[PDB]
């Protein structure tokens, strides 16, 4: 009995899920786990079950964009997911400090989408679970990988025009660290459906992927998923 | 030197483009053509040059959702596309009149997204080009396929909640025909970058509570229109 | 039994109606038809029945402004009108291309009013019926009159101040052709009440009437009304 | 050299102006005066110089609706008017207390228009000048005409629909007295251009569900106030 | 039986109430009346009953800020207050004309708060009662004290940042006289609960207290309260 | 040279500040410390330097409400504060789970104010610093005090009306724990001025329909956290 977009079953959904933008990235992640079980591939949603450090968790892709990743997150949350960690890339809003290849672990986001607003009034915060943020940070410490922490702007516009000015400059003076396209949506949906969420991002651009740094980030994401998967096993 | 997301080059972009959501649909479309050439497949964006009735145009996937599809449309418009037609599925907002399997060709859309709003004020209409619309309707007549016309609601929310009421009921009473997730964004981006746009949709569901020959028909109409439109660019 | 503002009866309303801003313009239009029947004149609303090319249709005035023309359109739509075509003047938002005296046939509009927003959420498009737009364009071809096509900004402000900046510059970079004060309102009301609407405008100003060009525009409007009136006779 | 819409010249504008919606009302008002002079009639704008109690002031029509009347008010304010009083009709939002034929003199209005918002932020109040208000009320006392005071809702929507609920019910509970279509716009334009404004209204209807002597009385009060106010401009 | 924040009883509330920002100011006001009766002091809300010119009225403090003064005004209005006059300080938005120490009597305000908007749609005017404004002005005439009249901007921001621009410049070109932080809130709450309100302010700053001028302002406020208290005695 | 409202000087501001609403609460807190020094009392702002566990930090009152408390937070942040913890009371929005007397330590807030919006766009989150949050939670563990975590609604409206429905019901369904009037403003101001913030609240009421030892416990936790945090500033 299958989920409309993900095309996996309720009983295939693990408590912990690592989510990812590029479907290609699922393939490159499962290959560094102890083993894996391919589950489904429909549209941009590729589902693979990972086995790492004695634990098991899904890794699922959602494509680019809040509306498309919302479908993913809703299907996960309405069907037994308890923890969802986003691993992806972003641009830097503090180019003096946060540089290409740097890793950012985020605790909150700017809701520059539409879905979240159709779900709850705009005054509501897009904010992550602390345990998840704490686990991610602690893993980065163990693995001896320096990270930044901060707020991400989650904006549905990648390409600005010359008519309405972009708000990236504002949000950067407001001390937002980075910009991507999915994190706020995950956070709001998670809060609404009692799922614990978090975000780890690698800087790939300076709108204002370094091979070994990407490998570190993935180690952190996977470690954190395994650490949190323990509490549910 | 390649487009950041689509991973094709400016020269590979034909004047007319057919756009679809599901990357799987690109492969089902290309075999209905006379011949084709695979160009690229990056993330949710699969690119293929189609050859139909002596004409040559791309077919490109954009995934689900306004933000993800805006990246596709922008890369296309900034690099030479002149006509972009969306072909996809949708839900009925008129379940007494418009039923699972029916085809709707839309002239305008409700902007229930965000990208379009980060680009111009919300008071600005999401409209399609009337030639594209007219071409689509005329193909539907030549191929003897009955077809609805109307307005689509393009909403970023597929799965509603119990706190903020959905606006579908509202837009239904306002005579919006049909609901999906991409058309408004296409239209506004097309208008701002001087690209003619249009959309054709097959009803796959009824959110109030795919037919193979009808899907085949819709693809036929879409491909027919693309060819007719490619004709006027030598 | 009379309509509250128009002061005509249900049975006096024809399927096709040409609407116009200046009440004076009704008088100048009826005089170039084959014959006419004056119906009423209340406030700014002058109603005259026209007979042209074997067809009959109302021609009605509504004054300047969205709130006042809404009353007109609502009384028409709630009482049997099936097609309403707006004929009027506008300013140009592309002064290099669209010049004083030029004719523009419009398919959609910017909803810079209030009525439409009190009727339906702002995300809803103000857009015309294609058959109407097609008929208008085809008439312009027959009569050998070159026209432009495009989006009109319908704005309730004619006179800007120096505090809030006008959006005309924005909407012009957005590729809007022209600016007037009624078209979006007609379009939204029409869509809401299953009436087919359209707009033909003559450029009279460059905010950013050429005697023979006005005569052409009126020929087009009247031809189009007669062509569409046929389908209902 | 004439005003674009009103078709009168700057010199023809008197310090005090009486404004009305119906162009037909201008003609009914001028004959109640001592004498008058027709000035112009263009579109919905009819202009007449009135002479009442040794005083001289214009009476001008503006049609229905905020956008159409804003053009009138702006042309007047930009060219020398100092006081503008609106006299017109309205509906009751307090049908137990305020009944068909009653007269209301309003100090402030709800801005349910658009023009005012394209001119300043919505947080800005639509208020009248208190002298004008006071003069109107004092005339009502001298002429022994009972009168209500309160806030008017100025709404661009006369004919509501079944999709977006009207806000009249709301504003009624908020103690707004009365409803019409022009006052808010007058007030805001007056405030921005340093012109003193006021309004007096006769109730012609009850949108929840014209009395000749009451209308005569209201016009008397309006003309009385205009004369008293024209007095202080030599 | 006591009010939740003010900690006074229904029967202690007089028909007329003078309200004030600084709790310290209550102490300095009661001392220039004929006599007084201290009632309560809870949080920032100090309540004292004043006896002046044969009349009696409360004088109550509410602190700085719309949210905090709303609590005060609601407790007063829901418990028998009929007239509430605000006496306080403000900055000047017309620095050429309205100078430090000048007195302004206000009839309306810009609703740059949140409470009023949670109570009623933003299109609703924040406007005072005329009798109150008239009384205040007439007292200023008797006492031979020159005053200004105008609209006050009531804004919840005292300290602007460099990201979103302040609207004070706009509201000043719009001909607003002064800026403070409570008046619009009083006016809206008053209108909603059939209480007559008014405002008298002394200019203390030029964001864009003169000892004898403050004394004048207080004389005016007190006179006006006594004059209005008569109608209810 | 003194701060305009707080009436203390830049040098008197310690890196860590404890903030409370009720000026009366400052006096009840200082006596629970090892020693203290009164600094100032102006309007609703009472300032006192506290000494607890060898550490030194201010305690300052800010009255009720976002606008009044923003003045306090801004004066503190502009003049050297590094950590600001809010300790106060609140209502339950989860009355089956969170009961009168329970303590909630909040990580984030709903921005139902205005100040925060005049400072940055509403899409920006009101979040606390996670160290502050973590410190507070750890103190609660050391002192063996059970404690809730969650999101607070910070609303400028204490007394709702019958015209515009309150949004508490909504935010409750959205899993907001608790409701008060200051936290969102603190958080946003902290984020914009690079100051770490947090909040701890005791439930005093149930707006759907103070326990002394629980209040004592909450103050203990707050003071404990302040000391632990002051430690890292020599
Ligand atoms: O500089 C950027 N701006 C906006 N999005 C992204 C991204 C992420 N990558 C995808 C689009 O490039 C999308 O998933 C977004 O979240 C990386 N860098 C940037
Ligand atoms: O009933 C519907 N609601 C919203 N979207 C869709 C669609 C289309 N399919 C995809 C998601 O189901 C998306 O691209 C959307 O445009 C088909 N039916 C519906
Ligand atoms: O340049 C213009 N700006 C705004 N409206 C108009 C108009 C039209 N004429 C009337 C006001 O001048 C009104 O009906 C509007 O629709 C002509 N030119 C312009
Ligand atoms: O009940 C009413 N609702 C809205 N407007 C009006 C009016 C006035 N009459 C005109 C339209 O009926 C218009 O100028 C408006 O201001 C009288 N009664 C009502
Ligand atoms: O220049 C000013 N701007 C904003 N508020 C005030 C005030 C008033 N004083 C208090 C804050 O300084 C507050 O009650 C506000 O209403 C005096 N001057 C100004
Ligand atoms: O149930 C409540 N709603 C709103 N505020 C509060 C408070 C706090 N107490 C003060 C007002 O009662 C204010 O500072 C607010 O933050 C306790 N309980 C509630």
Numbering used by the authors:
A (entry chain B), C (entry chain B), E (entry chain B): 3 to 210, 221 to 245
B (entry chain A), D (entry chain A), F (entry chain A): 3 to 211, 221 to 245
What's the publication's text?
Plasmodium purine nucleoside phosphorylase is part of the streamlined Plasmodium purine salvage pathway that leads to the phosphorylysis of both purines and 5′-methylthiopurines, byproducts of polyamine synthesis. PNP catalyzes the phosphorylytic cleavage of purine nucleosides to ribose-1-phosphate and a purine base. In P. falciparum, PfADA converts MTA to 5′-methylthioinosine (MTI), which is then converted to hypoxanthine by PfPNP. PfPNP, like Escherichia coli PNP, is hexameric and a member of the nucleoside phosphorylase family I. Unexpectedly, the PfPNP crystal structure revealed that the 5′-hydroxyl group of ImmH and 5′-methylthio group on the MT-ImmH are positioned differently in relationship to PfPNP.
Crystallographic investigation of the triple mutant PfPNP with Tyr160Phe, Val66Ile, andVal73Ile in complex with the transition state inhibitor immucillin H reveals fewer hydrogen bond interactions for the inhibitor in the hydrophobic pocket. V66I:V73I:Y160F PfPNP, a P. falciparum PNP mutant designed to mimic TgPNP, retains wild-type PfPNP efficiency with the inosine substrate, but has significantly reduced phosphorylysis of MTI. MTI is a poor substrate for the V66I:V73I:Y160F PfPNP with catalytic efficiency 160-fold lower than for inosine (9.0×104 M−1 s−1 compared to 5.6×102 M−1 s−1). ImmH binds V66I:V73I:Y160F PfPNP more than 600 times better than MT-ImmH with Ki 3.6 and 2200 nM respectively. Similar to wild-type PfPNP, V66I:V73I:Y160F PfPNP active site residues are mainly contained in one monomer with His7 and Arg45 from the adjacent subunit binding 5′-hydroxyl of ImmH and the phosphate, respectively. There is a reduction of hydrogen bonds in V66I:V73I:Y160F PfPNP to wildtype PfPNP. The Tyr160Phe mutant is unable to participate in hydrogen bonding with water and Asp206 due to the lack of the hydroxyl group on the Phe side chain. The Tyr160Phe in V66I:V73I:Y160F PfPNP cannot participate in the water-mediated interaction with the 5′-hydroxyl of ImmH due to the hydrophobic properties of the Phe160 side chain. The V66I:V73I:Y160F PfPNP pocket in the catalytic site near the 5′-hydroxyl group of ImmH is in closer proximity to CD1 of Val66Ile (4.7 Å), CD1 Val73Ile (5 Å), and CZ of Tyr160Phe (4.2 Å), than with wild-type PfPNP. In wild type PfPNP the sulfate oxygen interacts with ImmH O3′, but in V66I:V73I:Y160F PfPNP, phosphate does not seem to interact with the 3′-hydroxyl of ImmH.
